[PDB]
Design a protein around this ligand. Sequence first.
Ligand SMILES: NC1=Nc2nc3cc4c(cc3n2[C@H](c2ccc(OCc3cn5ccccc5n3)cc2)N1)OCCCO4
Length: 350
Amino acid sequence: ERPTFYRQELNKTIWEVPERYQNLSPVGSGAYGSVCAAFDTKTGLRVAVKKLSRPFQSIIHAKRTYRELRLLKHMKHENVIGLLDVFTPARSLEEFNDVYLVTHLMGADLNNIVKCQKLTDDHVQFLIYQILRGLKYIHSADIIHRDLKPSNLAVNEDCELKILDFGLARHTDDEMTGYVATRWYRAPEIMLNWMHYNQTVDIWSVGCIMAELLTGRTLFPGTDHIDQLKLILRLVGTPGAELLKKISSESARNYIQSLTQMPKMNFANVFIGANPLAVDLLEKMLVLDSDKRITAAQALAHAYFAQYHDPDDEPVADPYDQSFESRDLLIDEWKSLTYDEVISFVPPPL
Ligand SMILES: NC1=Nc2nc3cc4c(cc3n2[C@H](c2ccc(OCc3cn5ccccc5n3)cc2)N1)OCCCO4
């Protein structure tokens, strides 16, 4: 049965939400959509309510809306943000124009932790363990996050962590230009479009985050793409012929080869005083050749996580059908697919 909806002005736009959601207060707004904090009186949870902005204004927009809803509906894991609710005030497909997504209200992120606490090695172990636990789940569904960084990691007062805001394909070229955290955690093969990338790109980001938790400093704070590449190759060494072969862009290959060769540095002398097991794990995630990087499942079994690792409590995901990504549809067809997914949604148990 349809709940009763009520209306409110809020940001600059009209919000129409079921009565269960009370005390809406705006917290953020962008080109993707406006967000309000609220109290869900039916569950007792503080929630984030996101109203999508122009969900169906083009084919690209309509597909992205469908992609986001499919992803959030699938994610059911302690270390990944899931979907609490999705609703529309429309009573039929013909009047369907607005989409609202409801998720747990997340407070602090990994940024609000790195520059305040010195973080003990035990805290680093637990935080990275949870990222990898969530990543094992995400990767088992052939989902790549693509945009892992500290601002996409929520951490509550108990150092419990959740992965947020997947890389649904946006970050304009201008947002990735210059001295910006939007680029500091990206694998070089994605940064420079070397090749068709795999889910190992996320492991590179985890290595950058780990390092920053250990030192309190950005690992590769490049002032631009090329400066950042130089910082990376100084640490891990310039590529050998075997990795060069795998770079498809003849122009990217030629450029790499213009650089003076450099050996891999001693990580024990970079991460001074760190746990030798942390150094070993960093050496295995920050490998230039993504074919040779450690996977999430392999990293969970590394001795660095011995006090948390439990092979019977690191679950994998149900199969996730992404055939729609190869599909070409019209706006109204993406819209009807999205509507179907709204009306079939079943809430999680509390
Ligand atoms: N206009 C437009 N629409 C899209 N919809 C998408 C949907 C996808 C997807 C990509 C999608 N794009 C692309 C798009 C997405 C991300 C981008 O950043 C990384 C990037 C690409 N560079 C190309 C040259 C130089 C630098 C450089 N840096 C650049 C373009 N462009 O890949 C998987 C995520 C979900 O599926």
